[model samples]
Structure formats: structure tokens, C-alpha cells
Target chain A: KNPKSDKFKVKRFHHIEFWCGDATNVARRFSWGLGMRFSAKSDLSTGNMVHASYLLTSGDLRFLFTAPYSPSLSAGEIKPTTTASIPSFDHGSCRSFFSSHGLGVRAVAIEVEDAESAFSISVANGAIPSSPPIVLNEAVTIAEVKLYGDVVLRYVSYKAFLPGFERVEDASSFPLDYGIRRLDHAVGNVPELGPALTYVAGFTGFHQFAEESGLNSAVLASNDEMVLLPINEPVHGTKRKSQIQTYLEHNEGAGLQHLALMSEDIFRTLREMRKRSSIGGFDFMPSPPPTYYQNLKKRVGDVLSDDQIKECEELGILVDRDDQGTLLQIFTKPLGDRPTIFIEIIQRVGCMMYQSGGCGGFGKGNFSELFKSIEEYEK
Target chain B: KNPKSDKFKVKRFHHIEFWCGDATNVARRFSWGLGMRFSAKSDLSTGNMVHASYLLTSGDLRFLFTAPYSPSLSAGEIKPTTTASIPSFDHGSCRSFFSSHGLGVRAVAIEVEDAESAFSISVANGAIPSSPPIVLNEAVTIAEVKLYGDVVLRYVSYKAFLPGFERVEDASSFPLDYGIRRLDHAVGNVPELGPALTYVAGFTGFHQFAEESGLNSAVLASNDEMVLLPINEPVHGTKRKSQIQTYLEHNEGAGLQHLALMSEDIFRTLREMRKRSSIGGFDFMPSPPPTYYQNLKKRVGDVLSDDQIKECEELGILVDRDDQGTLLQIFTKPLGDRPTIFIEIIQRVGCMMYQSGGCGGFGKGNFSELFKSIEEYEK
Candidate 1:
């Protein structure tokens, strides 16, 4: 029996919030490039003057982009020394994040059956408290715990839309069905995976799901679904910097590296994402090496049809098969100026949930290819 | 004949550059929202290690968005003492501008017949020389004159694309013909319009083209075309803040308020831009009041047919007509986090080049509607 699996009961991902310099621009990237639809807004027009926040949703996935209101500084008052600094947890932090690190993920929220119990249990288990449990407009209760850098992990139970957000109808121009369905997992990159692993595993009772030569990962789950957290750190004393190390250096600290989006048909999803490239759509990561496909055929040719192999090759989709099933995946380029955050599109075929003896790994071959693609950009 | 009209012989607008915190995001707004195509880039991949610049184009219109490379500042280095002051000219000035003012127009380049003469004459007329005339890769000569804040006016004669930018083909997914054709004019908002007007008119010998209550504008011509500069300032001691004053306060100083883009079919152009609302397309300014449109009928009803008037009314297109012809125009909401820069799309019906007794104005009714619309947001 997985002893820790029943320690904390979780439901699903609630939403993700990115502290951005420009909420409108961030909203557009998710909506136009990633096929998320604008769902709500909180800003001056809606009576929230302290900051502007936009919510974008695609199926079960939701993203919130928040930016501070206009600055009150005058031209002569602005000085050279003011532009140097990293973003932290405080007011005007979003501006600092943008001014220093560019766009980055700030907080990841998850749904729990009892928010109060989750917060108390996690705090008792050594998780740093970011915000005490609070009821918003008496409709929703939420609590937050500190993660790497200024990134926080929020737990929430809500009845309606979160307080302070005004629902905006006819908010999106993107098609309702843009291929993506749900969030599969969220990955984090830390300077040293040891402490982060201890922090997350001890706090949430997540288990070490998999490990490779250079990568350490963990997974948390509810009775019905899975929540995977792949924590990465550079191998000690390696002259060649790992992608995780590069992310830590570029992002200035530990942060969310990427979120893998679940899709029913990854081929069509990728094709749609590709078509927007002409109009400033998302840019996919560099194509995998040709030998990568040849090796795929040698390894999992029987599991995948010939047409699927050819289509995946043409679309730069990588196929990774375990005894459980095959997973098709691809990645996007660094989401912003820094080579820190990006996105992954994934489809799991014949994969199992958290049953006893269930096997689910990132796939040894695909992991090597992902690192190679990332290395190309890190250089 | 106007004696000083031929003094500074210029062709048309070459390109406009914006200093942004994220050049990629800026390019996305222009490409996906405004229908411009990403045409070029300069980054680490292309040997530019200090910054990333993305160029977007639609017909003769070109925009360059530049952002400094990502930083690696630590949390300890981030201090409250570091986030104050306004942007001024110096090394890494674009980064400073972005950190302080968000995204603002930093440079407006004009195609000049003789770059050397343009630089020399402008300096002789009390203009501060930001950069001396220099030949770029032996293909073009360029010179720069300082304007308000950190904005620079550059004169150039180039046979190839701007130096340091590598040509990136198939860079955009947007349609090539997106209704926009050319730059119409650029608007600058200054604390005191007098100084900026004196600087541009004295430097380029541009004549005062038009004026209305609380506004003064000038125009420079190139025999067959014209480059208009509509300058604005607040009326001293007025309880109500002028739109220009709002811009100065939000932007922290003098800066480009908006750029008017020429469109042959504004109705179609606006419709296309509106369609992207679901995908983060540009939002437009407040619609003209019902009385304003009703008055438009009383004023230009005889000039436009019923269907044409109905279409314009439905799309929020404003109509201004003289004895020569009618001009159709519309405005977009502020383009960034700060309410500093927006865009105007315009189409002139039958205006002549340089008629001695002709009238060319932003229009009395249109100006009033514009201020009212701006005031709604300024509040």
C-alpha cells in the first residue's frame, strides 16, 4: 500500500496565476497562442484600482495574469539605480519581476476537499506559510504556502468565481475546442533538488515517482486523478550546466519550469498551435534530432501505427512508451525573454492512474531528447 | 509658395521603434492583434547578445520593439531604493525607459534625401545631437536628434534593412494584406506643447498645419506626401486635466501618444482587429456618444449615403469632411499597461497634397469625442 497517498485528500488543480507587467499582453499570449479563452477581469474599469488581473480558461485549465496599476513616478524622479533588483513577495513585485526577470509563473493553485485541513496539515508538516487561511467575500476559503523564490502554492475551495473578479462574457475570439483538455502535471526547477524534494514530499506526502541519472521527480495524487511534480537540479560539479541550472540562473531562482497540458489529439493540437506562427503565435522548441525518430521506431514501433509515427515525426512530436502505454509530447520555446518557463503538450495513451504497481515515467529516451532540445537553447 | 517648406526635404516615415520590457510580446500585439507580420529579429541567436529586437511590418509600415536581455539579479540585490526615478538618455537607456515607463515609443526614423544635411541643419537649429551621422555597413548613413524624454528622431538613407538585424523570412502567420497600408502621422504628448513644437518645427522647418482649443499641430511635407506632428499640452490651471497631461503623468514625461496608421478600408481593418478580441486582439477606445453620431448626420449627412453612414455608425468609425472629400477614422484603446500609446486608423477620401487654401484638421467634433473618450479612462 502507498502509505502517504491517503494522508492528504486533493481534488484537482484550481488555477495558475502569473504576476506579469502587463496583464493584457499575458492574457493574449494564453488566449491567442495557447488557445485559452478570456474569462474574467479585475481592473480599474471593474473597480479594482490597485492592479489589473485577467483570467483565461481552456477546458479545465485556468491562468490568471496580474499587473500593478500605473506608477506614480515622474520623469526626473526616476533614477538609474531603481531598475536593478529581482522580484519578491510584496507590493509592486509584479513590476519588479517584469523589469528584472520578464514574464514568469508566480503561483500555482490546487483544489482540495477541505482547504482548512490542507493548510493546517501542510503547515504542521514544515511548509512555509505565505498567507493564512482567509474567506474571500465569504464565498471562498483559500490559503497559501511558500515555494521556491516568490512562487507560492495556493489551496482553495470555492462555490462560484473567486471574489473580486467580474465575469466577462464573449471574452474570447478563439474556438471553444482548441484541442487542449486539462493539466497533466506542473514541473519545477530548483538549484538543488534535494531540499525542494524534501519540502514538497514532506508537505504534501508526495512520493518519489521516478528518477533518472540527472533528474529527480515526485508525484501527488487524489483518489480520482494524479498530480505530478518533476523537480530538477543540476548534477553537482558538472561544467556543462543542466537545463534546470540554466533556468535557476536565468529566472534568478527556483520557479515553475513548465506545465504539461493534456490533449486528446496532440497532432491536431500542435497543428493548430503551429498555424498561428504567421500571426505571432507560439513558437515550438527546436525540432528533435532526426536520429531521435529513428530510435523511436526501433523502440516503440509496435506500439504506434506507421501513420502515427510519420505524423509525429513531421510535427516534431516525441513518443515515449512504457509497459503501461505510450505518451506523445512536444514543447514550446521559452515563453518569455528568459529561458526559464515554457509549455508542454502531452497525450497519454493507455496510461494508468495511481493503482498499486502502476508504472508511469517520463520515458528515458524522451527525457534525453528533451534535454538535448533544451541544451540547444541554453547554449 | 511656402518659403521654408523645402528646407528639410524628407520622404516618408521609415520606421518607428518602441523600447519594451519584452520585445517578443510587443511583436505579438502588433502581429496578432493589429495584423502586422513579424518580419525580422535580432537576438543572441543572431549575434546580438545585449538585447532582443523584433520587427513587425504591414505594407510600408514597420515597427521595431527592443528589450534588454534578461537579468540575473538576486533577491538580496532587489531593494526598495532601486525602484524610483524617470528614464533619461544614457547607456542602456531603453531598458531604463521600459523599467520606468513600460513600453513607449523611443525612436521615429524618417527617410531623408540627404542624411548628412538633415543632421547638420537640425543641429544648427538648436537640436541636441544624440548621434552623429554614421554610415552603417556602408549601406546607409544615419543620424539622430534628441527629442523630449528619451525619444530620438533619426534620419536615414538605407538601401538594405537596418544594420544588425538578420532577415527572418516566413516570420509571420498573419496575412500580408491586412488592410493597413502606411503610416499616416505620429502624435506626441508633451507637458508643454510649445517646447516640442518649437523643437520639431525649428529643426525640420515644419509648418504649423492646424490648431484647436488646447492643441497645436505641425506638418512636414515631401512634395507628394506629408508627415504630420500633432502636439498637445494641458491648459494651465484648468481643473480638468487634458488628455495630453494624463499621458505625461502616466508616461512620466513627454512621449509619443499614438501613431495614425493609414488604411484604404478602415471598416474591414477594424473588423479584423475586433475579431481577435477573443484572442487578445487590441481593444478600441470608447464609442462616440449617440448625440455625436446624430450630429455627424446633421453635419455630413448630405455627403455620405445612408448605408455608408449606417456602416460607419455601427463600426464606431468617425467621419470628417471638407469641401475636397471625407476622411474616415477610428482609435484603439491604450496599447499597453500604462495609458500612454494607442493607434489610429485613418483613410482620407480626396485631400490634395498642398493646397494653399485647403483645410486639414483632426476635426472639431472628432476632437471633442476623442477627449471625452479619453477622459472616461483617465478617471
Candidate 2:
């Protein structure tokens, strides 16, 4: 294990940014489907000429959907209006990113004690810098470091740039609460695990918490373990091509694989998520094999009631248990055209539930069954 | 009028194709918001390797949302499989189309007696040929001619490429009917009206149906006047910059500005549309001036009931009438980040309604009032 660092401290995910084609519609869909509030916006209404972004939230969970304006527009294209000064963000890369990839997560941001120190410590340890610490409106400072492929790891001192975004109130088609609480963990997919994990571990001084070699996923976390980051890679052990390979090809490179959202009641959350037209709303994976559910008692010591287990089977949810407690989870199909990224709905039971990450452990027992549904969707 | 030597006759609109970032989600949203059925699909499930397309339908109305697969992938990247041969659709232009112009209509497709003849006549008569006639599966033949910037006027002899798209059934989030009927008319925006009008009329032998010079819009129609194409140009009149100029700037060039969907009951349709959260669902233009409603009797011979007039004001619907009939219309704000394109929900109430176009004269009375609402939306 590497020596602990005294340079800086990271709290949790500040927000995750999704680089997409239409922030208005995508954000609208996400806000509706996820029951998240359309909290803030930065677009034509706010005089942002370069791009449009809608920030969505549920409690501490923040997701940013961003889409670039016309890439070819020059300063002289339209007469300079009596508008506020336009802040500079690299909108040029957006064109290439969209073309190369599709709609997917582009940045993983972490709230930190001091963003500049985080940037300095990482760069000092040979981390490639994407953008140096920059202050916004004399209030908040943020910095970015290259994190494999087109994805970036951002550090922010305070979340004031959000103040720059105008407050938004979008009436949702469905009810507001789907019982979702906060982000449980974010998973990243790379070609290989060792290089990415070693690289990140070197910069952040994170200790490896969990590993599944056959599955090719390694979990890494900060000192206090407030944030959980799982890194996954495709393997050749199976007869079929790895779903990770499918993701890398469709996504064009390494990217955020999926993020799990903790829900108090996954049954209700899934019911609400599935209430929308199946294709229009979230489409979850097929249920695990009937045998798997039948043997749940023998496998996990019958922690759940018979009705809860049947509901899990009916709702296409998975369950697992460790020494500390039980875990409930489910996965969605690919969100867009590319069979790349999806979302996981998770719930932890017992032993400091919701206090930290991995309380109930990732769904270790549901890997192959869940994995086959992903591949079976093609067939 | 110039001597008409028409080679082929167009029956009706076959289907309009929208080049977007996510067909799955965009088509899903359109299907939900407009109460259209998810009719067919051509994607990974259908063995299309290059792009994903979802065809949506409401009666005779057909709308296709197509999004490209990753642009950088080469054939060798994935091992060849025993799948249906991927047919040809110029997907390379899609990446450029999405970047240059945000999501909007890319084709003005028409059902013709002889698509080959339509292509030959247009090409021989000084039309910029985008694609020569190509047959699909010995069942359907189609061709395309360039229509202004990035848009194409397509002609199809029969509709089977849709048959190639597997029939789909997606359960909707809400009720099935929003009262939207077939396509009423399609509109285009260009730098100037005269060049675009003369160019199309030269190839297709279209006759100018109506012209509003102050409004800078000329309504063009086919020989039988079944298909309506309204061409709009931004004028430098008014103190504020033209919204058309704002469109050209955000869209980066000329494009399909909007299309009107004829509905049987716009009052019910508007009510259904506004049921979703205002930001998530269709966000229509703000209400017209109060005086416009007060003066409706003097200007358009108050044909609507008192209750109907009050409902119009309450729902922000506009009303206009000519000698032939009354037109109930409402405009949504830009559908994407660009203030470029939107949809019009219109109902023509009068003599020979729904048989042809131009019964209500394209809302001549609602121009300035609706125009200011568009510009005022910024403030």
C-alpha cells in the first residue's frame, strides 16, 4: 500500500458532467425519468453563447447535461449584444467528443478542501493537467486533470459556479419522489485495470478496497472512504466478447461505465422508473435466472422475506449479502444508441446503511447473470 | 406562370428524417410528447451497424429519428458476425450535421408516382442532386436533391425501407391520443426568399400560393397544391435583430425552421401537451398581447365562442381567420439548444377543412403578436 497523503482531502462527487447533443431534451428526459429536480441552467437565457447546460439534482446528487452551441459560430457571426461577458470553456473539443463517442459521461468531479492543492499535488506526482485551477467570479476555484481517454477528474473548492447558473423549475410529468437518495458510487471502464488503477492510486493515494479478477473490476476509495470509484476492464476468459469491449468500441475509448444511485426503497423506485412508456423511460435488464432467485435462501441465508424476494424477481432486481449486511440492486439498458453506459439502482441494508460507500458490497453474486442479459439483449 | 412540364406527381409526405444524437431517446421523447406510436426500428436489433433509427407514426404521419454510431470505428475493430448486410445510408454527413446544426429535420420526403423520374427531371432541370435514384430491396426506390443548407428533398416511389425497419410497439407513458393528425405543412428558413423559391419552383414546377413580403415568408405548393412548403427569410426591419437571424446563427446555416402538425382538437391537445413539467415537455411560446384577444372580433370576425376565446388566452393558443376558415395555432420555443426549429400545432376550422392546405391563410393576423412573443422570450 502507498503512504497516506497529507496534501489535500476530497469529500464526495461534486457533480458528474454528461457531454451530449441536446441538453434541453436529454436533461428534460433525465429529470423526468429520474425524478430529479431541474435545479439550474446555463444557456441562451443566461447569455451563455457557447453551450447549454442543465444541472439536475436529488439531495446531494448532481448531474450536469451539457450540449454545445453551433461549433462554427464566430464572434462576428452575430452582432455583439448588450449581454454579460461570456466565460470561456473549451467548446471546441465538444464537437470531436460527440462525433468520436456519443452521449456519455465526460467528467468526474470531486469536492475538495482546496482545489488548487489537489491540482498541485496530482500534477506534482506526474498527473497530466487538462486545466489548471481557475477562479470563477471571485468565489469558487476548480481544476481538472486528465483521467484516461476524454474523461477528466475535476476538483472544486466550493460550488459557486452553480450560482452562475440560473435557478430552474421544470414541472415533471410524474410525481417528484422515486425514493432515490444520493450517488452510491461511480464506475469507470478502461481497457485494462492495472494501469488505470495504479495510475489513479498513485495520484490520489487511494487504497484498493475490493477486487474481482475474473470480473476485472477493482474498487478504489479515498482515505475516509466517503467516495467509491470502481474501475472495470474487459476480459477474454468468457466465450463471448466482453461487454466492456462493446463499450470501448461504441464509446470509442475509455469512459465512465456507470454510476449507482442509492435508493431507500428500490421496489418503489423501479416501479416509478418503469411506469413511463418502457422505451421512453428507463429500461432495466431482464431478471436473473429463476434458479438464482430460488436458491437465494441457501446462498444469502434468507435475509429477505418471501414477498420481497418475489418482488425482486418480478421487478428484475438482484440481491447479495456479505458479513456486514445485504445489498439490493438493478441495472438499466444502455441509455443511448451506443451500448456503453447505463445506471444502477442500489439499496444497502444493515451495518451503517447510507453512512458510507460499499456498506452492502457490490453485487458480487449477480455478475454473470447480469452480464449475460447485457449480451442477450443483442440476440 | 411559367409553362409547366412536370415529369412526376407527388402524392404526400412519406416520412421526415431528423438527424440527431440519440434516436432511442429522441424518438422516445417525440413519441411520448406528441402521442405518436413507436412504429419501427433499424438499429443493432435490426443489424444496422452504422446508425440507429426509430420510426414513429401518428396515422399517416411518419417521423424518423436517426443517430449515428461511433464515427471513428473501423470494420476490423470488431470481428465480423453472421448478421444482415448493412445497407448504405450516408452516416458520415450525420456527425457534421449534428455539430453544424443541432437536431432538426434533414429531409423533406415525398411519396411520388415515379421517384426515378422525379430525380431525373430535377437533376436535368438544374437541381443539385444529392443522391441519384437508389432502390431498396426491390420494393422501394428513392432519390434525394439538395434543398438549401444540409437539407435534402427526397422522393420515394414506395415505402418499404420502413418494412426493413422492424415493427415496434412501445407502451406510452400517457394516453395514446393527443389528437394530432397527419402533417399539415413543412417550413424552411433561408438567407433570402427569392433565390430559394425560384430555385425550387424551377425544378419542381411549384406555384407560389401566398406571399407576405413584410413577413418575408412565401408559401409554395405543388401542382395539385397538396404539399405545402413555406419558405421564410429574415428581414432587417424592426429595432431588434430578427429571430430568423438568431436561428441562422445558432443553426449555423439554412435549415428546416419548423413543421406544423394538424390536430383535430388543439384545445385538448394543448391541455395534454402542457400536462408534463413545462420545461421537460413542450414549452410553447408565451401568450400573445391582451389587446390581440380584445381586438379579435374587429380583426377576424369573432367566430370562436366566449368560452373558447377565454380558453385560448388561458392556454396561450392563437386564433386567426380568413374568408375560407379559422386557424387555431400555437408555437413551441426552439426544440433544441439552438433557437432554430420548432413545431406548430394548428387546426383549420372551415370549408373543406383537412382536405388541403391554406384554408386559414397561415395565420396572417397573428404574425407580429406571435413574433414579439418569440423575441420577448429572451427578456
Candidate 3:
């Protein structure tokens, strides 16, 4: 029997929270544009007067976008207490975050079996506490810790739905389903990769799995599940500064770089994104260079048919394979003006008969092409 | 034949410019959701490196949404010079405006025969100078003055496209048209209605065209065109404070309250808006009470058919009329979380044949019900 590693466990991403000046508009984009159904909401009507938050879900992914009420509206209201160790966890944090970073992710949370234990273990290590484990009613328990840059990591245990949020009735009727199934990974940009890697290693017990100096990236994963986190930093003194450097300067600080959404059908997802792009619905990153598709033909040689290769090339999908299977992916342009955050659509194909084997990997083979593609926008 | 009014002349609205942290996303909402086409763009590629701007058009109404490059990115770039008299028009104006107001209108430009005269005359009166009139590439001349609150008033001459903006080649291909004809009026919220009225009168020579003291509102209009500006301030000593006061408190200062877009067919436009609301697209203001609609029949009895009244009643469209004609109107909920800004859709049906009526009036008859409708959200 294999000895299972359990220093700490993050089953999967619980949610990603964005602090924006207007949560309503951002929620509309995700709900209407990205096909996420509005799941729940908390606002003045729901008794959360401090800020208005909208919860959206696609498959198992939950995204919370929050915007603060004016200071005057929240003046006499009692504020929710945050952990002493994290300065960005207090009330009016959304307002300050919006002022500092505009609209961007502030937290990436993971689901845990035992929130208290996960919180304790992380804090006992080098983790900075953002909020102590607390039970809201008997249904949910959650804890939070500070993560790389200004992002917070939350540990939560709940069956379904948040405790205080009101379920948005008839949200399922909204037509926004592009077949995105799960969150594959979330990338982060930092000033330097080494310190960030060390911080996560010491705090959450995640270990580095791969490194690519040419692209200036380091991939880390949890011991148990497929929680991949690839951190990137700008390489200084290079003739061309890394895209991560551009992100840092534009975002004004370390922040989330992009999120990859796992899709069952890469062709369908990319086709929908392309269709939307054509109609001026959603803009996407520039397509890969012609050489990229030619290389894909040679590397993915006999495994993929000529028709499959041609289809991927036509949609600008990038390909990478391991002994087990191949991963197909495509990148979107920066979601906003700053070129800080974007999104990725991905699919995993299993090599073994009917077994879905392209798990436990990032598209390392496509990073250079992606960097060059994004560099075109920088110019 | 007759002595034409020349006290002040504003041909029509040129454009309304918004300062936002991310102009791209907001532009998408206005384009895709509100049925405005992306008409033009300016950014680093177009040589406006300091900020990224998108010009959207609906009939003759032009809306420009701009987001500034981070201060670090534009460190050494030369900034546009603004007049010494106006503080809000200085360098990094968009960035500062975004920080202070979070995606609010900065400029309300009007077409003028001579930009220099309009600018100088306004400044000579007690108005704050924002920018001196300057010709742009021998195509167009423009100038600016500080308006009530943090907003600026731009004076411009235009033959076709804006001078400093490049026409977006493929923008017309986007499918976004909802039959919104032109701009009808723009409402501004101020700390005190009296001072704001005095400022507009002294500077632009606009006179009070209508008033509703009970609602703490006064309407001003240009001498030569259908440019209506309805200004509102919070009325004190009331059990329920004025919504304008709420706007001032929430926005941290005075700012735009709402913009009314002209529609030819209110029935079709509002029905589409309602259909969108059903599909989780844009939301509108709360529906009026049944009693309000019941009273509508009594007031404008038999003037509007049963089907017409039924349509307006079902959609909560308000009714206001003068001796010349009846005007149909409806308001949307605040565009964002602050309840500071929103939109209104209006249509004018002249009483007599082949006449354009309801030019210089607001929906005063609907004030009580509109207030109650908005107050529902405030709670």
C-alpha cells in the first residue's frame, strides 16, 4: 500500500472572490457573458449592509464578487471582524482593494473536510491568518489565511450554498452554459517566484512539481488532489521583459494572473468563445503563430489525426502531451484594460482506453507560445 | 422675422464621457446590453497612450468611456494641459476621477458653433476654466469648463468623427441596435440645487425651464436647442431625505444622477428591456403601485387607448403631458451599487399631427411614484 501524504489537504477550489467597485456589473458579465448562473446574493435586503455580494456558479466553481457600500451607509452598522494578522481582511476592505487595484481577485478559497484543523495547521506553519475558523449556523464552517500578494486563501466546509446568502430564485433559467465543467488551475503573478514558492511550501505544504526558466514559471500542486498553482515572475535584465512584469506594473502589485476552466469539449468551448468574439461579445487573445500549429503536428504526430490537428490549429488551441494523455487549451485576452487577469479553457484527453488521463499537468509545452502571443498585445 | 434667442446656444449634445477603472467592461455593457454600437477606439495603438477609450454611439448620442494607464506606465509621458482655474481637469484627470467617483461621468459635451467663444464666455462669468479651446488637426476645435460637482462641460465643433479618435473599422458589424433615437435630457445631483442652478445660469446662460420644489428639482435648458438639464438637490427637514442627498453622500460629492435616452417607440423599447430583465440581463427600477397606474387612467382618461395604457401599466412606464402632447417614460435602477447613476427611456407623442412635442419638460407628474419606486431599493 502506498503511504498517503496528508500534511494538509485542499480538496479543490471552494470559490474565488473579487473585490470590485461595482460587483453588480462584474456579476452580470460572468453571468451573462461567461455562462455562470447567478447562485445567491447578499445585499441590504439580505441584511449584509456592509457590502453587496453576488455569488455565481458554473459546475463546481463558485465566484463571489463584492462591492462596498458608501462609508456613510455603513457608518453605524456593526462590522464583521477579521483576523488580526491580515490587514486586508477588515471591513471596507473591498473599497480599499478597489481603490488600490481596481477590479481584481482578492481571495481564492479551497474546500476542506475540517476547517478548524486546516486553519490551525496552516497558522501553525508560516501562514498569515486572515480569519479564524468560524461556524455560521450549523450548516457551514470556514477559515481564511493570507495568500501570495493581496489574495486570501479560504478553507470552507459546506454542503451547498453559503449560510447567509439568499438563493436567487429561477437563476437556472438564464441561458449561459458553454460546457465549462471545473476549475483546472489559477495562475498568480508576483515580483519574484522564489519567495512565493517558499511561502506556499512552508504554509500549505504544497511542493514544486515543475519549473520553466525560459518562461519564468514554477508549478506547485497539493499533495493529494489536482490543485495546480503556477506562479510566474518577470525575468529582470532580459532584452524583452516577461509578461508577468507587465502585469505587475499595470496591476500596481502582485495579484491573480488568470484562471483556467476545465472543459469536457475543447472544440465546442473554443468555438463558442470564437463565435462570441466575432459578435463583439468577448474578446480573446491573439491566435498562436503558424509555426506553433506546425510544431503541434510534429509533436502530437501519430496520436492525433490530421483532421483533429487542423481543427485545433483553426481555433488557435495549443496542445501538450505526456505519456498518459494530451491537454488542449486556449487563452483569452486580459479581461480588462490592465492586462493583469485573463481566463483559459482546457480539456484533458486520457491516453489509456476511456480513462481520462491528462490530469496532473499544466500546459508547459505552450507557455512560450502564450508569452509571445501576449507580447504582441504589449507591443 | 423674429428676434431669435442668443443668450446662449447649444446646438445639441456632442457626447458624454465616463471615467472608469476598466473602460472595456463598461463599454461592453453599453454595447451589448444597452444596444449601443462600439463606434470608435483610442489607445496605445492609436497613439493615445495615456488612456484607453472606446466611443459608443446610439443614433446621435455619443458616449466615451475611458480608463487611464497606471501612473507607473505613463511615468514620463507628457500629459494634456488643462486650464489653471479647474482642478478636476488637470493631468491624470481620469485616474483621479475614477478613484474619487468610481466610474462616473466626467464630461458632458455639447455641440457649439465656436468652441473658443463658448469657453471664454463661460470662464468670464463665474465659471471655472478647464481647458482652452484648441484646434485638433484642423478638423475640430474643443474646449472644456468645470460643471457642477466633479463633472466637466466640453464645447466642441464636429463634422463627423471626433478629431483625436480613430474610427474603429469593424465596429459597425457588431449587432447592437435598440432603436434609441437620441439624448433627451441629463439629470445632475448636487449638494444644493440653488448654487448649482446659479452656476449653470451664470456660466452657460441656461434658464430655468421647469421646476418641482416638492421634489427639490429645477430644469435648465439652452436658448437654441433641446438640451435639457434637470438638477436636483436633497431637501432637508423631511421624514424621507431626497434621493439627490443620498447620491451626494454615496458618491462622496455631487455627480451625474441619470441620463435619459430618447426612444421613438416606447412600447417596443421597454418591452425589450423587460424581456431582457426576464432573461437576467439589465434590471429596471421597481414597478409602480397598481394604484399609480389606476390613477393614470383617470388623469389621461380616453386620451390613450386601453391597450396602450395596459402596456405602459404592465411595464411601469410613467405618463406626463402638457397642452401640446403626452410623454411616456421609465427609469432604470442605478447602474451600479451606489445608487448614484442610472438611465431613463423616454418617448414623446405630440397631441396634434406632424408635431414634435414634449421637448422642454420632464416627467414631473410621475415624480411621487418614481420616488417611491426608487425608495423601495434604498431600503
TM-score of candidate 2 against the unseen true structure: 0.91
Query: What lDDT tens digits, residue by residue, belong to model 1 across residues B239-260?
Result: 6656777777777788888898
Q: A31-136 in candidate 1: lDDT tens per residue?
A: 7777777777776666553567788888888888877655453222233222211112244566666666678778888888777788899999999988777666
**Can you list the residue pairs that collide in candidate 2?**
A171-B277
**Alpha-carbon deviation at A309 in model 2, angstroms:** 1.9
In angstroms, give how far residue B260 of model 2 lies from its true place.
0.4
Question: Which has the greatest TM-score?
Answer: 2
Q: Write the per-residue lDDT of candidate 3 for residues A184-222, one digit (tens) a residue.
A: 788889998889888876777776653333347777777
**What lDDT score is found at residue B285 in candidate 3?**
77
TM-score of chain A of each: 0.86, 0.89, 0.88
Model 2, which residues run further than 4 Å from truth?
A: A1-7, A71-88, A159-163, A169-175, A211-214, A277-279, A299-302, A368-379, B1-6, B72-88, B159-163, B169-175, B211-214, B277-279, B297-302, B368-379
DockQ of all candidate complexes: 0.42, 0.56, 0.40
Q: What alpha-carbon RMSD in Å does predicted model 1 have with respect to the real structure?
A: 6.6
How should the candidates be ordered by TM-score, best one leading?
2, 3, 1
Cα TM-score per model: 0.84, 0.91, 0.87
In the predicted model 3, the residue pairs found to clash are A285-A333, A350-A357
